[PDB]
Nucleic acid binder design. Structure first.
Ligand SMILES: [Zn+2]
Length: 854
DNA sequence: TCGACCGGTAGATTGAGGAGTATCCTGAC
DNA sequence: GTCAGGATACTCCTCAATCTACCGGTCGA
């Protein structure tokens, strides 16, 4: 890595460089700019004087750039002044400016340290060191000091927005083109100034703006793309290229390869969008044909930053990680569907036989480590630090794998290694608490913040270490901890909250957002809309509480005046994870469900008042006509199966079982719903058929549904032609006919008990546990098979019957004598457990038993 | 001590998808 | 010397599903 033009000087200067502390690798890295090789070797002892505590890595980084020697010579005679009154610069910021900005940027910051920080601009030192530390920062600084008043006054741009526009490589061009294109992009094409500033704050913002001005009246009026999609495509490095290829590769990818336009937009709205689109066009048939992938898998691989490399690497390495290392294609696609998936996938190929053998891991654990945006670094750090953490700190290997299976991964793991002997000895924590803080996205920041703030929040604010650890043990606990330290004196002393409520609000995902929103909205929601602080805190004490609380502000009068809901019902809908979605969906769907589908507002509120109440409501809208017309389920049963947490998957599974499952699965699913009568006869005699039809008629009239004589004749024919057929009468009236289930009870599955009740004529009735009588819910044997048989005997005129069940644990203890309460006078009920019944507890009965009445 | 083949409510924990922030390297002129 | 495009790593916020823990009325032991 040494050029022939450089060797004749590196050989001469190696003798001088060695002895100051420079290794040969540092010499090779620094030899990119030959002029530095002398300048360091003659002045090193001086520079460490001008820049105390600047390691050799920093010196190499500064001196190896395009103007490293000049940058170091400038920092030699400029670092004295920038550490003075105007800017409070230290060594780190000086090296940050000189490494990236260069000698020109250092000189510019030196000469203009007064005007930039002075009154007319009011730039903080951080903003100056962020504008200056970029490739060509002197031009950006001059352009800012020339154009800040104009943008901040004439165009209404915040100084933070202008600094974010200038804090990029093409900062000068971006500023000088925003200043001339804001009147046009925000008046003719209808973009908000925030959209233009989001477009322009990128490495090529001038090109992106200049090409959006042309491709808004083309990619919208012809290709059918919304302005939000265009301004999300263009808001990335080199967005001009992404737009120019979406202009020509949208007809092809949406016609030949059959990609949805939203899929193409999702592919293109990334840093290297053009390259990803071109390589998808090249590699879609090959990957979907030879390597067995589906188009959705390829789109999910390519919808990521630098997805061309990930896609090509999958093409190259899929026949190897599936044939030699044993990973399945789903796992390879999961590894590669991330940022820098090429590196993760190559590192898995390299290290999977090493981590899984020398360190005791398993392929699933390695794949779970690698399936993140920094999987290569996490895997390498795990291989480095498993011998160290697991014995010098006690962390069990699953704890290390849980720490590293996150987006940070390497950072959190190194920080844990550095900070376990501190937090566990001085601040009084335990390793479990540290591993709980660190097992999140950005746990290095959380750990450092806890170390810095635990002595403060525990004395000045009155909290406790458990509360601080609960606040910190989330994604972005640094922000929640800082905002708690900032706002607890205000929230707990002005609005009337208490530290318990503030800690409950903060102990969530976006706790900083929810806490600031509560500060902003509590003097409003409890003054105009009529809520109370307890209701607002309950709305806010969830993930995304800012969204839910703002949505409540927006939709309390609309919901409470257009649809007749009470404030309590709106608050109950909102007091859940995802309450914004639930509230918006309730607004959208309350009339449709209430009128077209024959529901009530209370049923819609009950469906929506659950975690995932938007999915559970759209699913009900989609599936109610199918279930209540073909399968005979009443709307009440659908409402009660959807009014549960996670009630979309349950309803979908019920539909799948009813549509294509085996007959026994349909039978059990239909019994597990409600008041259905599952009758079966023994022979074809007239008396038995009449008894079965009589029982069916009584059950039907118990539910208030009248059976037509045609249905009676059909049932009679079915019973008179099919021996062993099962008639299952659902509450709505539909009579399912199962021709062949079994003649024996199903195997016990540990959850639902089955049972068959036999009368004196051979008629058999089916029962399962659960769904007890609502008027006997106080009893401890409500929903047990024996109680169900007792109540069935009580309702009709049956005085001698035998119920067989299949629970291997035997008869309950509660049914020991409370079952005799439900039988009428003189009634005889014989419970029979299975052959292998054993008493699993102190009171179970596992033998044939007889109960009488009272 | 003696019992749920129950259900309802509250907090907790696991997983996924989206968006924003930050740094470094290559090529062109 | 500045500018444009591409790849990789880390931190923060929102939504959905599942899991776990606790508790009650009423009857012989
Ligand atoms: Zn029982």
């Amino acid at each position: 890595k040494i050029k022939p033009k450089v060797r004749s000087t590196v050989a001469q200067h190696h003798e001088a460089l060695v002895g100051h502390g420079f290794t040969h690798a540092h010499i090779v890295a620094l030899s990119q700019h030959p002029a530095a090789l002398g300048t360091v070797a003659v002045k090193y002892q001086d520079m460490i004087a001008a820049l105390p505590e600047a390691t050799h890595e920093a010196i190499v980084g500064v001196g190896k750039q395009w103007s490293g020697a000049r940058a170091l010579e400038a920092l030699l005679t400029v670092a004295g002044e920038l550490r003075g009154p105007p800017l409070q610069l230290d060594t780190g910021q000086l090296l940050k400016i000189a490494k990236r900005g260069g000698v020109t940027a250092v000189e510019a910051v030196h000469a203009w340290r007064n005007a930039l920080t002075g009154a007319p601009l009011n730039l903080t030192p951080e903003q100056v060191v962020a504008i200056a530390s970029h490739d060509g920062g002197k031009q950006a600084l001059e352009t800012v000091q020339r154009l800040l008043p104009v943008l901040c006054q004439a165009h209404g741009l915040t100084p933070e927005q202008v600094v974010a526009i200038a804090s990029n490589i093409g900062g000068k061009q971006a500023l000088e083109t925003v200043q001339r294109l804001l009147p046009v992009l925000c008046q003719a094409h209808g973009l908000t100034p925030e959209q233009v500033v989001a477009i322009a704050s990128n490495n090529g913002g001038k090109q992106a703006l200049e090409t959006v001005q042309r491709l808004l009246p083309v990619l919208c009026q012809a290709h059918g793309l919304t302005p939000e999609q265009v301004v999300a495509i263009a808001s990335n490095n080199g967005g001009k290229q992404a737009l120019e290829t979406v202009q020509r590769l949208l007809p092809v990818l949406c016609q030949a390869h059959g990609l949805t336009p939203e899929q193409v937009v999702a592919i293109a709205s990334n840093i290297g969008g053009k390259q990803a689109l071109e390589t998808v066009q090249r590699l879609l048939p090959v990957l979907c044909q030879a390597h067995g992938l589906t188009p959705e898998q390829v789109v999910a691989i390519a919808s990521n930053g630098g997805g061309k490399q990930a896609l090509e690497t999958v093409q190259r390495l899929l026949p190897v990680l599936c044939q030699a290392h044993g990973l399945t294609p789903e796992q390879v696609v999961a590894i590669a569907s991330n940022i820098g998936g090429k590196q993760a996938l190559e590192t898995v190929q390299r290290l999977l036989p090493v981590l899984c053998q020398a360190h005791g891991l398993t392929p699933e654990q390695v794949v779970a480590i690698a399936s993140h945006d920094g999987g290569k670094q996490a895997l390498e750090t795990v291989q480095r630090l498993l011998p160290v953490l697991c014995q010098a700190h006690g962390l069990t290997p699953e704890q290390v794998v849980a720490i590293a299976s996150n987006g940070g991964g390497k950072q959190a793991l190194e920080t844990v290694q550095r900070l376990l002997p501190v937090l566990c000895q001085a601040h009084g924590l335990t390793p479990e608490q540290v591993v709980a803080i660190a097992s999140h996205d950005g746990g290095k920041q959380a750990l450092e913040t806890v170390q810095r703030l635990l002595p403060v929040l525990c004395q000045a604010h009155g909290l406790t270490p458990e509360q601080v650890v609960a606040i910190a043990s989330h994604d972005g606990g640094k922000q929640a901890l800082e905002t708690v330290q900032r706002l607890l004196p205000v929230l707990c002393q002005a609005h009337g909250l208490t530290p318990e409520q503030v800690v409950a609000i903060a102990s969530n995902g976006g706790g900083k957002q929810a806490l600031e929103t509560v500060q902003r909205l509590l003097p409003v929601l409890c003054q105009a809309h009529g809520l109370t602080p307890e209701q607002v805190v309950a709305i806010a004490s969830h993930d995304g509480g800012k969204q839910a609380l703002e949505t409540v502000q927006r939709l309390l009068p609309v919901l409470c005046q257009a649809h007749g809901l009470t404030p309590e019902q709106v608050v109950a809908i909102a007091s859940n994870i995802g309450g914004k979605q639930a509230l918006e969906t309730v607004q959208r769907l309350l009339p449709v469900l209430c009128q077209a589908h024959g529901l009530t507002p209370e049923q819609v509120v009950a469906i929506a008042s659950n975690i995932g109440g938007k999915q559970a409501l759209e699913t009900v809208q989609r599936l109610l006509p199918v279930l209540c017309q073909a399968h005979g389920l009443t709307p009440e049963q659908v409402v009660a199966i959807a009014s549960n947490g996670g009630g979309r998957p349950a309803l979908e599974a019920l539909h799948a079982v009813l549509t294509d499952g085996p007959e026994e699965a349909k039978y059990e699913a239909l019994m597990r719903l409600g008041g259905a009568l599952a009758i079966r006869i023994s022979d074809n005699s007239e008396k038995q058929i009449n008894t079965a039809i009589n029982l069916i008629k009584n059950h039907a009239k118990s539910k208030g549904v009248e059976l037509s004589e045609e249905d009676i004749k059909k049932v009679e024919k079915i019973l008179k032609e099919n021996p062993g057929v099962v008639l299952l009468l659902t509450p709505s009236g539909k009579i399912h006919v199962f021709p062949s289930i079994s003649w024996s009870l199903p195997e016990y599955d540990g959850t639902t008990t089955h049972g068959v009740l036999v009368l004196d004529d051979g008629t058999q009735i089916g029962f399962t546990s659960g769904n007890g009588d609502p008027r006997y819910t106080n009893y401890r044997n409500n929903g047990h098979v024996a109680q169900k048989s007792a109540l069935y005997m009580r309702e009709n005129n049956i005085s001698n019957a035998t119920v067989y069940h299949n629970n291997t644990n035997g008869t309950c203890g509660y049914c020991n004598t409370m079952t005799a309460t439900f039988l009428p006078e003189g009634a005889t009920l014989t419970v029979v457990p299975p052959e292998n019944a054993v008493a699993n507890n102190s009171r179970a009965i596992d033998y044939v038993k007889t109960y009488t009445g009272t």
